[PDB]
Each structure stands twice: as C-alpha cells, then as structure tokens.
C-alpha cells in the first residue's frame, strides 16, 4: 500500500539515509532517469518500490538486498519482485529478507504455506 511510502520516507529522513522513491505517483519521464541513477554507482543505499508500479519489469542491478513488508498471495509476482534485483547484470549474491510478525495473520499464512508447500491460500484462520 502507498500509505506506508510516506512512513518509510519519514523514517529514512529521521535516520538520515540517502533514499529516493518510485511509485505510481512518480511521473513517467522521471522514472527511467531515476532507475538509471540508482543502477549507476552512487551513494544511494535505500530504494523504495511498489508492488504494482515498479516491481514488475525493471532491470535494477546495483542493489544486493530485497526486503518485503508483506505478501498476501505470492506465487509469482513476489518472486518477480525479488528477482527484479536478481538480474543478469548482478555479480553479487542476492539476500532476501521477509518481514513477518509473530502470532499474527502473516505468521499463520507462512505456517500454512509451509505445511501445504505454499500452493494456494484462500482462507486463513486459527
């Protein structure tokens, strides 16, 4: 959800990181230039994405880490998002970190996916 992009921006500004954000609100012309700027060598360390805006077909290669806040139904598009960094222009190992809370809906979803080998989840309850 885009309602957490502002939260992430505020958090990074408070922590003083060199960040830069891309989403559906970003203009079309600036998108390619921003992607090129991040992919090229720079001091930017954190890059903020969106599930549907730029998590589909960009060729980001400078980064080495992927962090997921949430993934409800994730057979392929979350795999697509994590492999967006894992492109042919990458020369370093890819580390993927998933953020899941404890005793929450996401924890039960992950447990049921592990029990059912992560085929398809429609109803989650406990």
Partner 1 sequence: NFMSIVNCLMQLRKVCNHPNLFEVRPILTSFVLEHCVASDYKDVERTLL
If the CB atoms of residues 33 and 122 are measured against partner 1, the closer one turns out to be 122
If the CB atoms of residues 60 and 109 are measured against partner 1, the closer one turns out to be 109
- Least spacing, CB of residue 41 vs partner 1, in Å: 31
- Least spacing, CB of residue 33 vs partner 1, in Å: 29
Reported as type and span, the H/E element at residue 12 is helix 5-15
If the CB atoms of residues 17 and 69 are measured against partner 1, the closer one turns out to be 69
Q: What does the binding site for partner 1 look like in residue numbers (CB under 8 A)? A: 1, 3-4, 7, 69-70, 72, 99, 101, 104-106, 123-124
If the CB atoms of residues 101 and 115 are measured against partner 1, the closer one turns out to be 101
- Least spacing, CB of residue 106 vs partner 1, in Å: 6
Alpha-carbon span 105 to 44, nearest angstrom? 33
23 torsion bin: left (phi>0), alpha (psi -120 to 50), beta (else): beta
């Amino acid at each position: 959800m885009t309602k957490v992009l502002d939260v992430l921006e505020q958090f990074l500004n408070y922590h003083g990181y060199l960040y830069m954000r891309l989403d559906g609100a970003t203009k079309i012309e600036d998108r390619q230039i921003l992607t090129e700027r991040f992919n090229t060598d720079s001091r930017i360390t954190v890059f903020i994405l969106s599930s549907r805006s730029g998590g589909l077909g960009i060729n980001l290669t400078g980064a080495d880490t992927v962090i997921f806040y949430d993934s409800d139904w994730n057979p392929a598009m979350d795999k697509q998002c994590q492999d967006r960094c894992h492109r042919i222009g990458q020369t370093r190992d890819v580390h993927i970190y998933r953020f899941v809370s404890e005793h929450t809906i996401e924890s039960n979803i992950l447990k049921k996916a592990n029990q059912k080998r992560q085929l398809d989840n429609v109803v989650i309850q406990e």
